[PDB]
Design an enzyme around this catalytic site. Structure first.
Site, PDB file in Angstrom:
ATOM      1  N   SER A 120      -5.017   3.184  -4.947  1.00 57.94           N
ATOM      2  CA  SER A 120      -4.224   4.122  -4.198  1.00 57.94           C
ATOM      3  C   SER A 120      -2.843   3.629  -3.866  1.00 57.94           C
ATOM      4  CB  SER A 120      -4.969   4.460  -2.917  1.00 57.94           C
ATOM      5  OG  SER A 120      -4.559   5.743  -2.485  1.00 57.94           O
ATOM      6  N   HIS A 159      -6.954  11.047   9.127  1.00 59.53           N
ATOM      7  CA  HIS A 159      -5.588  10.593   9.213  1.00 59.53           C
ATOM      8  C   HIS A 159      -4.649  11.312   8.263  1.00 59.53           C
ATOM      9  CE1 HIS A 159      -7.176   8.388   5.751  1.00 59.53           C
ATOM     10  NE2 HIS A 159      -5.926   8.357   5.335  1.00 59.53           N
ATOM     11  N   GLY A 199       0.795  -1.219   0.000  1.00 55.07           N
ATOM     12  CA  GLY A 199       0.000   0.000   0.000  1.00 55.07           C
ATOM     13  C   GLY A 199       0.827   1.269   0.000  1.00 55.07           C
ATOM     14  N   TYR A 236      -9.673  -0.552  -3.374  1.00 53.57           N
ATOM     15  CA  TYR A 236     -10.737  -0.339  -2.413  1.00 53.57           C
ATOM     16  C   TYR A 236     -12.074  -0.437  -3.130  1.00 53.57           C
ATOM     17  CZ  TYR A 236      -7.008   1.586   0.646  1.00 53.57           C
ATOM     18  OH  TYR A 236      -5.879   1.740   1.417  1.00 53.57           O
ATOM     19  N   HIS A 296      -7.247  14.029   6.302  1.00 58.92           N
ATOM     20  CA  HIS A 296      -8.404  13.741   5.473  1.00 58.92           C
ATOM     21  C   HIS A 296      -9.192  12.596   6.021  1.00 58.92           C
ATOM     22  CE1 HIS A 296      -5.064  11.567   3.567  1.00 58.92           C
ATOM     23  NE2 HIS A 296      -5.943  10.610   3.243  1.00 58.92           N
ATOM     24  N   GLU A 331      -1.006  10.366   5.919  1.00 56.86           N
ATOM     25  CA  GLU A 331      -0.391   9.172   5.351  1.00 56.86           C
ATOM     26  C   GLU A 331       0.732   8.617   6.248  1.00 56.86           C
ATOM     27  OE1 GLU A 331      -1.786   7.784   2.341  1.00 56.86           O
ATOM     28  OE2 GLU A 331      -3.196   9.122   3.378  1.00 56.86           O
TER      29      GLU A 331
HETATM   30  O1  LIG Z   1     -11.217   5.791   0.166  1.00 60.60           O
HETATM   31  C1  LIG Z   1     -10.339   5.390   0.924  1.00 60.60           C
HETATM   32  N1  LIG Z   1     -10.359   4.134   1.414  1.00 60.60           N
HETATM   33  C2  LIG Z   1      -9.394   3.648   2.229  1.00 60.60           C
HETATM   34  N2  LIG Z   1      -8.337   4.316   2.636  1.00 60.60           N
HETATM   35  C3  LIG Z   1      -8.236   5.617   2.184  1.00 60.60           C
HETATM   36  C4  LIG Z   1      -7.134   6.389   2.588  1.00 60.60           C
HETATM   37  C5  LIG Z   1      -5.988   5.831   3.316  1.00 60.60           C
HETATM   38  C6  LIG Z   1      -5.884   4.622   3.920  1.00 60.60           C
HETATM   39  S1  LIG Z   1      -4.320   4.414   4.546  1.00 60.60           S
HETATM   40  C7  LIG Z   1      -3.879   5.971   3.970  1.00 60.60           C
HETATM   41  N3  LIG Z   1      -4.814   6.619   3.351  1.00 60.60           N
HETATM   42  N4  LIG Z   1      -7.030   7.676   2.222  1.00 60.60           N
HETATM   43  C8  LIG Z   1      -7.970   8.211   1.428  1.00 60.60           C
HETATM   44  C9  LIG Z   1      -9.066   7.524   0.950  1.00 60.60           C
HETATM   45  C10 LIG Z   1      -9.196   6.199   1.347  1.00 60.60           C
HETATM   46 ZN   LIG Z   2      -5.218   8.552   3.255  1.00 57.93          ZN
END
Ligand SMILES: O=c1[nH]cnc2c(-c3cscn3)nccc12
Ligand SMILES: [Zn+2]
Ligand SMILES: [Zn+2]
Length: 343
Positions: free
Chosen positions: A280, A180, A162, A169, A268, A182
């Site tokens: 992602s 959170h 990841g 997702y 975010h 990153e």
């Molecule tokens: O839609 C999401 N679904 C799951 N995780 C997300 C994260 C994320 C997860 S770990 C770091 N950023 N950041 C933004 C959007 C998502």
């Molecule tokens: Zn994120």
């Protein structure tokens, strides 16, 4: 928030071709200050011809999202479910029980979200290892960004699922991601391959410490147990709760075929409107190295050795930093040094 507003970019094919250059460009525009930016790719660009062959794709660990709470403050608990295919997931997602409610406008759906998030727990087909990009796609490939983050794998050989690999997702109505930043306060790229939109909330990096102070006040138990408890990705705070305590924030809805860039220390959270699929990964710029050095980590986890970055881009400071005498103050308003050719 005047410059904290989320910005949308519509690059041409020529501009869209160099990813890193475009990241330096949107920063030269002040996109980084909001903590979140939207990038709409050229109409002539597609990462895959069709999504009709992914029905038998296996989501190994679907998570059932249980939310506990009241008065705009909630905690999300993830319960792992048995592996399921995309076909089985889409059936549940579009079923009468879990499908998106009827709604006039976004403000109405967003109200239903916050009114019903502790009820009828949805299943999130999260953290699936893989890409939906075709092998030949050279522009904005989540699988192979080619940023300075590549040094982690190039010098050591270490792979972080990841973080320097892509994740998929598969969401359904009400599934969500908590507030959170990153891992290692890195950047992130998020592409909505298909389906219903993904709505997002963001606190500008300049005001991130205020969100942290707030979360501490609401969950003092969690704060005593771990300084970086927001990293657990369990905390859900209503936009009303933020508004009430004067936390500046902005909202944006991402639709199929659109990109969302999160910047270092950009808090975010968001939710999925209905059945969709997002890809992602994390990435970096020269600007991130100071954030990685100063990132407060979880103490209960993703830890990247910063020594390689400091050696390469900051050799002058390597002696001072290793001694713990590096008192560098981060200016969240400043763009990446790469943006010099534009500003
Ligand atoms: O839609 C999401 N679904 C799951 N995780 C997300 C994260 C994320 C997860 S770990 C770091 N950023 N950041 C933004 C959007 C998502
Ligand atoms: Zn994120
Ligand atoms: Zn922790």
């Amino acid at each position: 928030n005047p410059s904290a507003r989320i910005m949308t970019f519509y690059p041409t094919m020529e501009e869209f071709r160099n990813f890193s250059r475009y990241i330096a460009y949107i920063e030269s525009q002040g996109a980084h200050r909001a903590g979140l930016a939207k990038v709409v790719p050229p109409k002539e660009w597609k990462p895959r011809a069709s999504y009709d062959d992914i029905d038998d794709l296996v989501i190994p660990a679907p998570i059932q999202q249980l939310v506990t709470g009241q008065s705009g403050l909630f905690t999300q608990y993830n319960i792992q479910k048995k592996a399921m295919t995309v076909r089985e997931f889409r059936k549940i997602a579009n079923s009468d029980k879990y499908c998106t409610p009827r709604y006039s406008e976004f403000e109405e759906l967003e109200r239903k979200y916050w009114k019903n998030l502790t009820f009828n727990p949805p299943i999130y087909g999260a953290d699936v290892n893989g890409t939906l990009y075709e092998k030949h796609v050279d522009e904005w490939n989540i699988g192979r960004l080619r940023t300075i983050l590549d040094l982690v794998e190039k010098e050591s050989g270490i792979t972080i699922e990841g973080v320097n690999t892509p994740y998929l997702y598969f969401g359904m109505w009400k599934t969500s991601f908590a507030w959170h930043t990153e891992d290692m306060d890195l950047y992130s790229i998020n592409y909505l391959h298909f389906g219903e939109p993904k709505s997002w909330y963001s606190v500008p990096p300049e005001h991130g410490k205020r969100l942290e102070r707030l979360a501490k006040g609401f969950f003092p138990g969690s704060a005593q147990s771990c300084e970086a408890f927001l990293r657990h990705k369990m905390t859900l705070i209503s936009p009303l709760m933020l508004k009430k305590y004067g936390i500046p924030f902005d909202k944006v809805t991402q639709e199929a075929g659109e990109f969302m860039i999160t910047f270092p220390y950009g808090y975010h959270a968001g939710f999925n409107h209905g059945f969709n699929c997002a890809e992602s990964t994390n990435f970096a710029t020269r600007r991130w190295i100071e954030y990685g050095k100063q990132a407060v980590l979880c103490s209960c986890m993703v830890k990247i050795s910063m020594d390689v970055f400091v050696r390469k881009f900051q050799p002058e400071r390597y002696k001072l930093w290793k001694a713990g005498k590096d008192n560098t103050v981060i200016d969240h308003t400043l763009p990446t040094p790469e943006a010099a050719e534009f500003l």
